[PDB]
Write a protein that binds this ligand. Structure first.
Ligand SMILES: C[C@]12OC[C@H](O)[C@H]1O[B-](O)(O)O2
Length: 339
C-alpha cells in the first residue's frame, strides 16, 4: 500500500491506459525513427545493480541502446554499477553522484518503501527526467509530480502466475517455505502476493519465511537454515533468480530432489537451470520489451508527445517439461534485441 495496482492505476486514468496501450503497440511494431531532429546529443545516466547472476539489467541496457540507435536518437550513456552488498545509503550516494551530471534522463532502481521521500525529494529538485526500473505500481503520494516513467514487469502478476501453477502441482494444505529478497518493496510485492494467494486459494501452510541479502550465497545459506529448521516441505518459493540458484545449490547438497523450486524472471541462467532440470518452473519475462519501451518513450518526449506514467511487459510460464522448441521460440521473443 501507498501504491496503485498497475491495472488499477490504468483503470482510474483512461488517458493513461491509452498512452500505455499506444506504447505497447509502439514496442511491438517496427522502429519508426525520430520525427523532430535534436539540437545536440542527449545525455543519459544509468544507476543499476552490478555483478548479479540475473542478466536483466545488462540485457535491458543492451536492448535500450539498440533501439535508440534504430530510432536515430543521438545519445551519450554514462553507466554506473552498484557493487553488491551495497547498502541503500551507498546506492543513494551513487544516485546523487549521477545527478551532479545534469543529464536529460536518469534511469535507475531504488527501494521505494525504504527511500520513498528521498526519491520524492529528488523528483522535486531536478529538471532531469527519471525512469524507475523494476517497478510498475505508481506511488499515490506522487500525484503532483510523477516521474517520467515507471517501467518493468509487474511483480504481482508474475507472482500470481507462479501461484496459479503451484496450485496445479500440489494438493490443498501442502507445506512450503519462502525465500524472500532483501526486506523491502520486492519482497512485499513478489512474496506476500504469493503467500496471500496460495493461502487463500489452496490452503497451503507456510512453514517458514526468510529474508536474504538478495545474493546467490545468501539464498544458499538461507535454504540451508530453512531446511535445517523445517525439513518437511514440498516446495520452496524463491523471490528472485540469485536466491533461487543458491537454494538449488543447497537442495543438491542436502540431497533433496523431493522439493520443488521456482525461478523468477527467466533469464539465461534460469533457462539453463530449467533445461538441466535443477529448477522446476519459472515465470519468464519477455525481457527486451522494457528496454525498447524506454527508447520509445524518449523518442516521444523528443517529438514533444505525451508519455505514459507506467509500462509493464508480459510474462510466459516455463517448466522443465517444455520442449527445446518452445524454449528457443521464447528466447527468440524475449532476447530479440539483446540476443
Ligand atoms: C530484476 C530482478 O529483480 C530483482 C533482482 O534485481 C533481479 O533478479 B530477478 O531476475 O529475479 O529480477
Amino acid at each position: 500500500n501507498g501504491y496503485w495496482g498497475y491495472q488499477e492505476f490504468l483503470d482510474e486514468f483512461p488517458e493513461q491506459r491509452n498512452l500505455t496501450n499506444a506504447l505497447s503497440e509502439a514496442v511491438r511494431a517496427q522502429p519508426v525513427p525520430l520525427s523532430k531532429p535534436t539540437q545536440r546529443p542527449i545525455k543519459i545516466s544509468v544507476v543499476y545493480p552490478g555483478q548479479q547472476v540475473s542478466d536483466y539489467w545488462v540485457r535491458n541496457i543492451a536492448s535500450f541502446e539498440k533501439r535508440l540507435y534504430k530510432l536515430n536518437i543521438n545519445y551519450q550513456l554514462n553507466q554506473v554499477f552498484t557493487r553488491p552488498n551495497a547498502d541503500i545509503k551507498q546506492q543513494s550516494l551513487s544516485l546523487m553522484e549521477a545527478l551532479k551530471s545534469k543529464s536529460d534522463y536518469l534511469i535507475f532502481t531504488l527501494d521505494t518503501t525504504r527511500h520513498r521521500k528521498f526519491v520524492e525529494h529528488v523528483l522535486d529538485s531536478t529538471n532531469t527526467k527519471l525512469i524507475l526500473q523494476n517497478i510498475t505500481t505508481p506511488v499515490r503520494e506522487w500525484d503532483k509530480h510523477q516521474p517520467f516513467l515507471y517501467v518493468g514487469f509487474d511483480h504481482a502478476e508474475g507472482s500470481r502466475e507462479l501461484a496459479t501453477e503451484f496450485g496445479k502441482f500440489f494438493p490443498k494444505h501442502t507445506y512450503y517455505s519462502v525465500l524472500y529478497f532483501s526486506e523491502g518493496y520486492i519482497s512485499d510485492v513478489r512474496g506476500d502476493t504469493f503467500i496471500h494467494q496460495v493461502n487463500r486459494d489452496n490452503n497451503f501452510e507456510l512453514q517458514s519465511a526468510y529474508y536474504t541479502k538478495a545474493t546467490k550465497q545468501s539464498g544458499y545459506d538461507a535454504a540451508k537454515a530453512s531446511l535445517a529448521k523445517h525439513p518437511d516441505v514440498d516446495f520452496i518459493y524463491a523471490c528472485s533468480t540469485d536466491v533461487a540458484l543458491g537454494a538449488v545449490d543447497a537442495l543438491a547438497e542436502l540431497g533433496r530432489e523431493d522439493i520443488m523450486i521456482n525461478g523468477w524472471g527467466g533469464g539465461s541462467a534460469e533457462l539453463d537451470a530449467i533445461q538441466k532440470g535443477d529448477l522446476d518452473i519459472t515465470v519468464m519475462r519477455m525481457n527486451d520489451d522494457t528496454g525498447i519501451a524506454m527508447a520509445e518513450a524518449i523518442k516521444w518526449d523528443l517529438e514533444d508527445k505525451p508519455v505514459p506514467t507506467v509500462y509493464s511487459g508480459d510474462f510466459e510460464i516455463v517448466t522443465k517439461a517444455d520442449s527445446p522448441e518452445r524454449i528457443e521460440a521464447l528466447k527468440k521473443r524475449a532476447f530479440r534485441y539483446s540476443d
